[PDB]
Subunit: 244 residues, 4 copies
């Protein structure tokens, strides 16, 4: 039992974008720790990653669990040198119907979790004089959508936090970036109808929904030496749905 590869931590790795990111980072040569909210899901991740990764249960809303998970990774696999913040649900509602819990839960799962996990991995990245924090944002952080004020506020806050952290950590060669997916094919889009997914792809310049692997490719690029002079940016992967 000796683990010599650099360690990547991917939260919310069970399916879709998170699963593709985790598998791509494995292919890139990392030892990947993926997280799921349940222990069953964590075991499914352990099974998928085999001897080049591990699955751990983590509710990113809880600081005690964040600290325990990162401590476990450091004590068993090594310092987290790539952090991909992908965990996170939506709780949509127009503001008149958006409850205190609807707001707080989303802000905690997305923005607070990014703050907590980034803070927790900073010591190891600083010691290594190498680090990658890659936050999965969304196109709705830029192109606002009614009913997603909580999600949009959280994602935009994550982007601003990333800029501040990039400035604080730049001299230690830690890059902090966000990837903003557009319409990507997920179980959720699979749930939608043919006609709705044509409505969606009609809004995309490339005239199709993206795939999880497109986001994985963007993250793999940002985590590599090929993006060592890129920090504090948003990398939009939306097929021209939103251009900035």
């Amino acid at each position: 039992m000796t683990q010599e590869r650099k360690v990547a931590l991917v939260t919310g790795a069970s399916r879709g974008i998170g699963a593709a990111i985790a598998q791509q980072l494995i292919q890139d040569g990392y030892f990947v720790v993926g997280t799921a909210t349940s222990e069953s899901g964590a075991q499914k991740l352990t099974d998928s990653f085999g001897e080049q990764g591990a699955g751990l249960a983590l509710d990113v809303r809880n600081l005690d669990e964040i600290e325990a998970v990162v401590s476990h990774i450091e004590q068993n696999y090594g310092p987290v040198l790539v952090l991909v913040n992908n965990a996170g649900i939506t709780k949509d509602n127009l503001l008149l119907r958006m409850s205190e819990d609807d707001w707080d839960d989303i802000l905690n799962i997305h923005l607070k979790a990014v703050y907590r996990l980034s803070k927790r991995v900073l010591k190891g990245m600083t010691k290594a004089r190498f680090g990658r924090i890659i936050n999965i944002s969304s196109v709705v952080a830029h192109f606002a959508n009614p009913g997603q004020a909580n999600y949009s506020a959280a994602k935009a806050g994550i982007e601003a936090f990333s800029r501040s952290l990039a400035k604080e950590m730049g001299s230690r060669q830690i890059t902090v970036n966000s990837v903003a997916p557009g319409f990507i094919a997920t179980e959720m889009t699979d749930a939608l109808s043919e006609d709705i997914r044509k409505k969606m792809s009609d809004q995309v310049a490339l005239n199709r929904l993206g795939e999880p692997q497109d986001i994985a490719n963007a993250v793999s690029f940002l985590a590599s030496d090929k993006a060592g002079y890129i920090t504090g940016t948003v990398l939009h992967v939306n097929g021209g749905l939103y251009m900035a």
Copy 2:
């Protein structure tokens, strides 16, 4: 007169906003966190306003204050969310309390107050929600991750709400001040604020009245086709 609610109106930007909105013809309820401050606000606004105590961190107080305003003065049709509290620290030294308090005072308060005033604005088919953001939401500053995240969240929240409320002719906008002359800015002496003003194209720190002018514009009929935007008032410190 139409009722405007301005939080944190005791001094600086908030006070200038309240006085300007009074001049524009609104009945201005300004808030302070202390009852002493609320009484001084009552005294300053006189017959064209009222002062109320409000800790914007507390939902019960928000609901009570808005209910009181509705019961005595009228529907809140202009809401200006003005908070300027900082708890700076580099992330290594930024505690959970430092993060949470800033997020609550700024972003959560914007959520709570905006939600609470929606009914009256919807009924009137008229509304102005004006959120005080900051240049730091765009031009990042080391040690202000919490403040930057909160202000950027406020801007994104404003865009979403603007889409939700637009058809009722309610506009939701943010004003982003740059370096404005204040208590703490006055505390540093000549070379330090020369360091600051050297970054400003207009080569000077702004004044609270500049932000009040932007808020007055957005709250007026002159800006009825402007919604979901950020109005930068920073002398060229940061340029779209």
Copy 3:
């Protein structure tokens, strides 16, 4: 014959947005020189402005005419202390069908004209330690539209030029800003059908087309002392059609 009011120059003042801007600046207390491309149009402007303005013919594509017009204003009315660059047409075409003239004419009418006129009025603004350059951009400089690559490139170039000039002239208290109209009711939108203008207003958060006076209000604000700490910005007046 003595002219004591501050002089504003509004190019393309014959109708719609330009006409509303010119009339509002008159109401604000300026002596307004408006331009039209023909001498007939210039005479119609002279008639509309009466004793508080003048109409002059100007093809903004031509440097000799720019220099002659500004010299005439300085010699008869006073230094141009407010410049509103509004002259400018569209020549739409998908790139495969966009000719050299289609490109050059639009770039010259919009971007080159802004460069030439701003350069020409800088001396007077510098001497006065007061100045307002206000450029009418467009929402399509931000939300790109197929078939308008020339117009979009010109408007975005104008915005970048404005940022550079704002930095160069800031210490002399000259502000340089752009106003970006969205769907505003013009003869061109009047030409469109009821159903198309509902398609358009359906995209606007405020659920209606704007009016020239909305743009005039934005320009009047920027030209006043109420916006003396605003420079190098874009003021979007699009009813929520585009949010940034």
Copy 4:
């Protein structure tokens, strides 16, 4: 192999781009304005490329070069518009020639070359147009109004063209370098580029290979769902 055309490939950013695209598997035609430079490009690329002389200001030369490439090597399916010529001056001192030459070398050339390669990309239902912009298109620099306007125009042009060509699976993107180590940057000595690198979060000037890496990414299958964007490569000098 697929044919990529890289303008201004003789040195620095352009040379790094050309070499990297060769490594990625493209047949790279690089251009220089002199025939001497074109021959040196031919020598450097050897069996995996060709060097051609091109003054990007001249439409006839653009059409001749692209026709030659089509007649000998194949359809241009990757176009990298790389120009880095400056003619700085504050507006008071910026002549008509200084403005026009920069606009022509940068923006007009992007228009002309992009237009000329559209037919082959459309036929192949594959394409990469990658335009070298600059941080100055976003963070304004006194004395560079012409360069800033041209680069920003290039970015807007790219967005419009991306919408026009997207359904044919042609992506159009810009790469915006920050402070990259070059001839002229090397000319200034330690304290001057320390002044520069102090503005960079990563606390150093970039290298041509960083821009080549970004262009290689965008030109690859790894970026097939990225279009109409600006990829900032500036070490945190300017942050979206």
